[model samples]
Target: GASKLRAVLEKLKLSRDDISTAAGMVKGVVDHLLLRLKCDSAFRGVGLLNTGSYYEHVKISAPNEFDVMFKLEVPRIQLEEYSNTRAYYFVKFKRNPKENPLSQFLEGEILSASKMLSKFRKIIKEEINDIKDTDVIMKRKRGGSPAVTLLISEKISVDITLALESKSSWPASTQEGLRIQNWLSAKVRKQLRLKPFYLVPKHEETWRLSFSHIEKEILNNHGKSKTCCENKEEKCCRKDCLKLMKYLLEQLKERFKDKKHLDKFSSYHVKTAFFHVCTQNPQDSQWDRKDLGLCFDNCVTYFLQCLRTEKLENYFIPEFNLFSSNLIDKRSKEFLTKQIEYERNNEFPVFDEF
Candidate 1:
């Protein structure tokens, strides 16, 4: 049965050639868009950065999905918390208002994310038509989504997010969080904290905080010791556990085809849970490669506890809970907790069914 689990893991991994090819294709398109956008005076300062599972080396099953951030630098802006969840903000330009190209999109003091994002989509549609490739098509815009989605061939879909990067201090809620100093060093934590945060378009007067870059860095170098997975040191099962958790969730979604209620429960939730687990048990020996099964089970147990308690806090911003506020009424938390517990007790029979 455990051997079957190992087989499933092997099957879920993407080939090196496939990964490289998809990345190369996505980069080519992104670079083309950025170059074209630079011609417009409004988008002269735009920059691109890769963020998400593929970049972090935690992507499972396919190499088709990618997320690239098209960031605009905003200076001297005041950020007012938008919702009860401290992760979003209403940004207000405070200085040099005349010099800002985005000033046209401002409604009162707050920038209109919807207006800016629509312009981004318009640019992509116009530029993509000029490209020689006929296979690439722009996906129809969905309401309230910040991403400009592009379909490359039949398999790959790259989400180009329109974001604003702010260099101001992070919110006070995050000061006590990102407890990675014990796992990574104090130097690493400090360096990450000093880095600028990103905001993506959502609703009017509100933008969501994006920590994809920081998450990428942490996942790539996720080791208790500096040399845990480098040089001749043995590898740990951290990434493997995350992959299994993601795969489990995917399988459960397929099994329960009721309104796609589980759609909101994403791989990011599992990834966040893994980060909390790592911080709680910050020992290289605890996640030894040889003890992969045990480590994976332990991670699953931690996730179950989070679901049962309905309290999965965002790792970087503790104020935002990963669990939905209406989780109890929706019964999603209860369903997931029971399903995972069943799999755990039955040696993961769900994996076998797959």
Candidate 2:
């Protein structure tokens, strides 16, 4: 309305500024959720698949015995796919189980049983040694403790040590062993499947898949017409997805190669390995190829030992610390002495007894 000579300034209105600020805030939240909170290489496609928002679910409850119930929150998209939706909640303890008389009695029983077993094993070892020292002509029917000692005699004592050992009544039953084995096997299988790792066989080799390999697989599976979005079955191509997985696997294999070498250098090495590498590098963008080459070189050597020697199996527990620590101290002179001896005579690495 000002005259031609006067200029009218059209400053931004308050409403416009408010709208701008609101938009910025919303964008910030979305960015935080996508990039910082949920965007992990381990959980690819978690936030991006445009899954619905996060929603809270049921509350857990606790009684005077430190029981509590709290609401669970999970992503809305995941909730639809899964039945239950809940976030974790922290609960406070009300009573100490250790303070109960029954609990204390059970604990004491376990300890007493353990001590008794140890003493029995010691007695057996002494008897066996005593029998060994006597002449063959004086051999008696190895009875009592001596009979118990024969349970662990090794056919090859080249790198073996005689140790007093006792059988635990707890794990002696087949049912108990089978029950534990089932639980453990189920967990291990699921873990290997979900994680970016798998158990490689003793003689089996690992392979790395390249983008070209994946493209070739996709092309072969889907004709040339179907390789691109222009094709009606573009979604069926699955080239990109496979490449991504391959890239991650390759990275993991490279980073842990040294650990594999450590296993070969150590005598207690096992034959199974798991690889859990993720690819964030642009170079890794092509892991989806179907023709990925599998080979020994593609996998880190001895990376499979961790799975083979899990503590629950007890096969590798006795040598766990020694195997790990010796690898760490491999550079030292004393360590070198042991390493050389082991390389020449193949002796097991020793560690401080637990």
Candidate 3:
């Protein structure tokens, strides 16, 4: 057990106290940056202040340098600002966690693409210290090549591209992101001093690929299932639901295959994936809601089930149970009212519970 604990510590690169310190520091930095950017004119204009802006559409256009060629740009000054803010802190503190005890410990202990550059800096320091007296000193042995290490470092340092969706009109997206961020922040605060992590809000454009005919089939089949389930003979409906689910899953898989850029992100290159499916409706209230819970129950359930066949079962399931429901609604409303609440304020209800 002692060896295991030491191994774990070495892998994570920090002693317990060091990890704690880093986590708190991360939270403080993220909270500060979120607040700074949230209130800045650019972020406010982008409707980050509005709890429901995730569903709204954002405009995109290309800027033409006097040459006829143009580069596409989303009206995402706020999003860009936030991304840059994150990068700035990442670069600033990656080399020196000793400023805060948390970071100092994290330096050589773990494998995280998000923290790669910082980790590299730590590794270099360790190597230099270890080989100070060697005639032909090298930090690491022959297990991994230096070229490969440099390649990985370069990948980590590359600028992350933002994929902005429609604005606050998609309230569920914003709500879901807030919830995930809250969960992550609380975990960080409780376990370690906050270390900076990345939150890339993204959604697949599968909805656009859906044809009107397919949409009709989805609604018709979903309605039929709801009808059957209402009478307590839900098997037939469940089958229909499954069929629709399979089709949608196939579509998503195909869509995923086409996304070369998305494929490049190491953070996403995992056998098991995790994400949230935002919905305005709750499970128990599905039938009572409009469209017979088609969006929440039928569409989402089908999509996830189909994904299982492709081995993508690890996903962020949004609990929105009564406790969480009350919390998010309350906080969202309060933050909206204040208009000065920072990114920390934008968190999901569970943060307060923790």
Candidate 4:
């Protein structure tokens, strides 16, 4: 079992050269965008925030994907829940309405995601074309998606998202969430709470809180002690388990090409399960390096349980169940639970197929 798991992990790991190359490519694109934004009158006070799996160091296999947020600093904005989903919000300028640079893009009191995203797409297209390399290609926009996708090469792609970074108080849904106090310290939690949250262009008339930055922080500093992943201290297998789960999910998607059945089950659901697993087993010693196989199995079992119960709550927002009523049905949940059980019983045939 150990050999099988280790073998799979070996294949999952990305090389130093691959990581460096991906970083260089992403940085090049970010730098170019920053320069463009600085010169453009339309995007006066915009800034870039690098966030996602690649930045969090939990990225497995090829480092082909990257996420960058083009954040506009909105000092005063009123936020109200837009839908049953606690994550989304209706953002409105609270003060100095006429002074807002983004005022032209707003429709009545609500910000038009379509109009703003369209402008952003145009800016990116124009700016990327002027760059020296013509290899970069802009992908066609997806319906109801936030990101402006750019293909850097045959192997790499970066998503540029138009976002608003707000320093306002977090929603009521998050008040009982981010239960990291047991794993990390209260001080760290306080500091994280004090940090700003982001809203990207996805849902029309709704601003969803983007926690990629917070996630990166938590992953990097994820240790019971102050120096869990340091050079001198022992390293845990938390991120390794997460990477494996993500890999497994990807494999499942590939094997079961029925979008209608598996579309609701995503890497986010897996990630949320992993976070809850961490809370359940809070100690670093529980995830020892030599015990990676056991730990990974435990994580998978937890995910399977979540699927069976149909109650995987979002880690950042406790009220938001990832397996919401509209997102997943009983049949789909049963199907996935059975699939995971099969993988566990069969030493993960999915990994071997990869």
lDDT of 3 by residue, 12-130 (tens): 23322232222232223223333443453322212121232111111001011000100111221112212322111111123342333223323243212233323333433344344
lDDT of each: 0.77, 0.23, 0.25, 0.77
Please report the candidate that would top TM-score against the real structure: 4
What stretches of model 4 exceed 4 Å from their correct place? 14-23, 50-59, 144-146, 231-233
Q: What's the candidate order when arranged by decreasing TM-score?
A: 4, 1, 3, 2
- Stretches of candidate 1 above 4 Å error? 14-21, 50-59, 141-146, 231-233, 327-330, 350-354
Off by over 4 Å in 3: 1-251, 254-279, 287-354
- Per-residue error for 263 in candidate 4, Å, reads 1.9
* Model 4 agreement with the true structure over 266-288: per-residue lDDT tens digits: 67788889989999999999988
Model 1 agreement with the true structure over 138-218: per-residue lDDT tens digits? 876675453677888877777777778888887676897898888887889999999998887653568877887888788
Better of 2 and 3 by TM-score: 3
Between which residue pairs do clashes occur in model 1?
A: none
Cα lDDT of model 2 by residue, 18-97, tens digit: 33222232223333333432233322222321123121111001000110111111111000111111111111112344
Model 1 scores worst on lDDT over the 10 consecutive residues at: 50-59
Q: Candidate 2, 317: how far from true, in Å?
A: 13
**How well does each candidate superpose onto the true structure, as a TM-score?**
0.90, 0.20, 0.21, 0.90
